[PDB]
Symmetry: C3
Subunit: 114 residues, 3 copies
């Protein structure tokens, strides 16, 4: 899976070890091996949420499977909790788009997962 | 909904009020309340469009519904118009990908919209 | 089509002419005119792959058609090869997500491709 967070919070406010925490928590939540988890955090962005530039985040999670109604509710609670605790972003200022990718549409290591 | 614009135009050429204009115009165009509109502008990017690096933009609009043939033509006229007027990007150097998101695949506030 | 690469490799390691190489190689690979190929390279990112901060890349290719099982395997070999040769990123530290876009969902030049 791949998790991306774009935020207006400054880089210096992203704590040390945040990418590793995201990797470990996503491996556990999605069931996927840590080897297959990629994470990307983009601070210092020019963004607004509801017209306000108070701290906010726009995120995405792409995964081959492990996406669905109940699972995405669970991921949203986990990820909003991490963003609130570590980046001090209110959960009502976070969107996370979820994508269930077909294995044929994910390239890796000179091939695809199909 | 969420609107993202990535552009090679420099940050100093993004005028004051641009995120607010996008928020308000997208609220009107999508019919969704502005409280629900998130916007993200990414200037100074390393980009080419058709092999050249005159001003260009790559954008996306994600929305739960309010996406379709006619609506997307209307969004493109509105958004290209704003990028031309405010960022001086020619409409023929803009791509906007549209995504009609299922409510279960949009997280917010510790849950999803489903 | 649109190709985006996000990577932790530094900007100075992206060779001169890389955007043009991606444009031309993608025009050939997809069969589409170079005028329609847009490319975006984002270096210096805060990213991890498999928990590791060694060089990695997260990429996407969006195209109206020219996406499928065999084509995506061929694109992945081409693109991993370019990232390995030009950016020194190991292919097993690259993801590429592929998207077959409906023409009605790709805006351009005040309208869509539909
Ligand atoms: O999904 C959303 C996004 C923003 C938002 C803002 C509000 O003030 C509210 O009452 C509900 C909301 O729901
Ligand atoms: Cl995956
Ligand atoms: Cl589920
Ligand atoms: Cl897919
Ligand atoms: Cl929405
Ligand atoms: Cl429509
Ligand atoms: Cl969806
Ligand atoms: Cl295309
Ligand atoms: Cl589509």
């Amino acid at each position: 899976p791949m998790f991306i967070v774009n935020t207006n919070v400054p880089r210096a406010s992203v704590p040390d070890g945040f990418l590793s925490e995201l990797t470990q928590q996503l491996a556990q939540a999605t069931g996927k091996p840590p080897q297959y988890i990629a994470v990307h955090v983009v601070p210092d962005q020019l963004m607004a949420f509801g017209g306000s530039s108070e701290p906010c985040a726009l995120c995405s999670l792409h995964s081959i499977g492990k996406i669905g109604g109940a699972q995405n509710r669970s991921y949203s609670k986990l990820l909003c909790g991490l963003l609130a605790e570590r980046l001090r972003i209110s959960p009502d200022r976070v969107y996370i788009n979820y994508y269930d990718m077909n294995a044929a549409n994910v390239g890796w290591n000179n091939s695809t997962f199909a």
